[PDB]
Design a protein around this ligand. Structure first.
Ligand code: C5P
Ligand code: CA
Ligand code: MG
Length: 637
């Protein structure tokens, strides 16, 4: 360089052949530029990069190779990992299954903690060879727990998603004067129906028979917002959290315990403030326009338990209602459930029973068992009432406000409707490209797709399915087969439901109301996504623990094929819900006679279909790698 010579070398440097792509590693790696273009990265060039870094590289020939030059976006930022080789030099291996190398690190200042071998930390990347640094380097920013802590699962997972490990701090109660007029519901025979363990009754039922074969339902929901003022510390604390995070064996509540457990909870034979909704149902099950929201106080008559209620109703088991009054409430409520089920059957969509697996844990967080808790009438009684109540709120907020915290499902996006109909044709199912975009046509497709003898064709259109949203705008819910949809029935566990509670309270008083900001539903969606990941990561750890001792044994498990790709089949164990992977080479000896097609949902050997997505097969457990929590399964025989 030399101003002339420098300008020249610059212009030369600038026209050097280049490519942008994502780094893929293993033994050297590749710069994956697109679907059918990749460049070999030699292992010396490897050193500059991490798996998954988005980079620009010099392309070299003379055999072509990519020589990394510039970082576009690093794979790794904030992460978790296990520390090594102590303070005389710390390094950290990311928990990332594809990131195998130790990264030199040190503790952030103020981090009191003396790190040892095995310790779990949260860390931040600070240096990268492509940013000119000699080495990769990270700062440790948080001490997690020690390497052989039994409670690893929980603490590492909460930390990795940066989620809170604690309930919020309780604040001196005193009930707020919102100038509500509370109807005295106290004489009435309200009952709660929850599982056994529950001490935090959110909700509350009362039924009454009417002339013309009608039924009256009142849903009474607990009253947190009668204590928590909009703008208070608990407020802003609850809003950040969005939802109680339910993890195997462990929840982190949105609200303080005293409030949840005690003051708000609809405990039997105690007087409680409530937000109530009285609805009138046709013989049809139809929710009539008769909808009345109002503040009230009730006194639960009977703290009921699901199984017991399900038993009494099927004339099985030992348990009877404490009185005729309660019996009649249960009977009326079962009648309501029946009409609503029918209604949703006929006019909406009823979701197909998905086993809900519960981990049964011991004191050191061991897995005793994982059981699919099946659903019985008492469960459906509650669900049908909660759904009708939430429909009620959606209508009234839409009507009286024009806004609320709504749950939103747009159906198939218009730009994918043609591809949709074409794929169904190839499988022999007629549907229309523009009818399926109407609520009615979406429901008709769903219905006949669930009359399918198997889930195959179903599976074929997962790729077209939209997901459930959060909106302040009233809107249809195609998944539920409903014009509208907003929840207010569990405000102690959901910030959105508290917001709707305050909105409904404005409507009741004839007050004006402010529309929630859209950043509202954005943060809510982010925490939901977080909580779901947190629960599956827990579960994953747990499943590995549970299945470790089955490794290499001939224990069989029936398993549903959930996904098929290039490298093999993902599989869900029917009896416990664990995820396992079956590598392609396990399915057939001769690589070139085997085709696992992601796009078809099939595995073929010598041109003949042997496996399909939704098939159930029997597998054994080949491997449980505790490092990565991965379960490897092999088909039987
Ligand atoms: N596109 C991607 C791919 C991975 N990464 C991160 O790499 C992280 C590495 O996980 P660990 O925290 O276990 O090392 C992932 O959990 C993910 O947050 C990312 O931030 N963006
Ligand atoms: Ca790793
Ligand atoms: Mg309840």
């Amino acid at each position: 360089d030399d101003p002339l010579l420098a300008q020249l070398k610059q212009q030369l440097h600038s026209q050097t052949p280049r490519a942008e792509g994502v780094v893929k590693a293993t033994e050297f790696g590749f710069l994956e530029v697109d679907a059918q273009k990749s460049y070999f990265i030699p292992p010396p060039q490897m050193k500059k990069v991490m798996h998954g870094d988005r980079i620009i590289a010099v392309i070299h020939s003379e055999r072509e190779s990519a020589e990394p030059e510039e970082l576009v976006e690093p794979f790794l930022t904030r992460f978790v990992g296990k520390v090594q080789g102590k303070n005389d030099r710390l390094a950290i291996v990311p928990d990332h299954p594809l990131l195998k190398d130790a990264i030199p690190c040190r503790a952030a200042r103020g981090l009191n903690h003396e790190f040892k071998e095995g310790d779990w930390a949260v860390a931040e990347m600070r240096r990268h060879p492509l940013k000119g640094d000699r080495s990769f380097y990270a700062e440790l920013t948080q001490y997690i727990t020690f390497g052989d802590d039994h409670f690893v699962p929980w603490w590492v997972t909460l930390a990795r998603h940066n989620l809170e490990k604690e309930a919020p701090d309780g604040v001196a109660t005193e009930m707020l004067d919102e100038g509500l007029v509370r109807e005295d519901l106290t004489a009435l025979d309200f009952v709660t129906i929850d599982s056994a363990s529950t001490e935090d009754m959110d909700d509350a039922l009362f039924a009454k028979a009417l002339p013309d074969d009608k039924l009256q339902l009142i849903v009474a929901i607990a009253d947190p917002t009668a204590w928590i003022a909009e703008g208070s510390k608990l407020d802003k604390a609850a809003k950040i959290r969005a939802f109680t995070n339910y993890l195997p064996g462990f929840n982190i509540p949105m609200l303080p315990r005293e409030l949840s457990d005690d003051l708000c909870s609809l405990r039997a034979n105690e007087v409680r403030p409530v937000l109530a909704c009285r609805m009138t149902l046709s013989a049809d099950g139809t929710i009539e326009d008769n909808i009345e929201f109002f503040a009230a106080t009730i006194e639960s008559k009977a703290k009921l338990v699901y199984d017991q209620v399900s038993d009494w109703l099927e004339n099985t088991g030992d348990w009877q209602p404490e009185s005729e009054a309660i019996a009649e409430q249960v009977r009326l409520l079962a009648q309501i459930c029946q009409r609503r089920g029918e209604w949703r059957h006929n006019h909406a969509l009823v979701f197909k029973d998905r086993p809900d697996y519960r981990f049964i844990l011991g004191e050191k967080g061991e897995v005793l068992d994982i059981v699919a808790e099946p659903r019985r009438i008492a469960n459906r009684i509650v669900e049908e009432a909660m759904i009708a109540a939430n429909i009620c709120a959606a209508r009234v907020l839409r009507d009286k406000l024009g806004f609320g915290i709504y749950n939103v499902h747009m159906g198939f996006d218009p730009a994918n409707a043609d591809a949709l109909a074409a794929l169904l044709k190839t499988h022999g199912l007629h549907v229309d490209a523009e009818e399926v975009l109407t609520l009615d046509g979406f429901c008709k497709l769903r219905r006949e797709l669930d009359a399918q003898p198997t889930g195959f064709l179903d599976s074929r259109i997962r790729r077209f399915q939209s997901f459930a949203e959060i909106s302040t705008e009233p809107g249809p819910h195609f998944g539920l087969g409903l014009e509208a949809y907003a929840t207010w029935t569990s405000p102690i566990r959901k910030y959105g439901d508290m917001i709707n509670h305050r909105l409904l309270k404005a409507v009741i008083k004839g007050e004006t109301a402010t529309r929630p900001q859209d950043e509202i539903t954005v943060q809510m969606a982010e925490r939901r996504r977080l909580n779901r990941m947190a629960e599956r990561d827990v579960g994953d750890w747990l499943y590995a623990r549970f299945l470790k001792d089955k490794a290499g044994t001939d224990t069989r498990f029936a398993a549903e094929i959930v996904d098929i790709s290039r490298g093999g089949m993902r599989v869900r164990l029917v009896d416990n819900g664990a995820i396992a992977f079956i590598p392609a080479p396990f399915l057939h000896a001769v690589r070139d006679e085997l085709v696992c097609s992601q796009e078809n949902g099939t595995v073929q050997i010598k041109g003949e279909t042997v496996y399909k997505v939704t098939d159930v097969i029997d597998v054994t457990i080949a491997e449980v790698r505790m490092e990565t929590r991965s379960i490897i399964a092999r088909p039987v025989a």
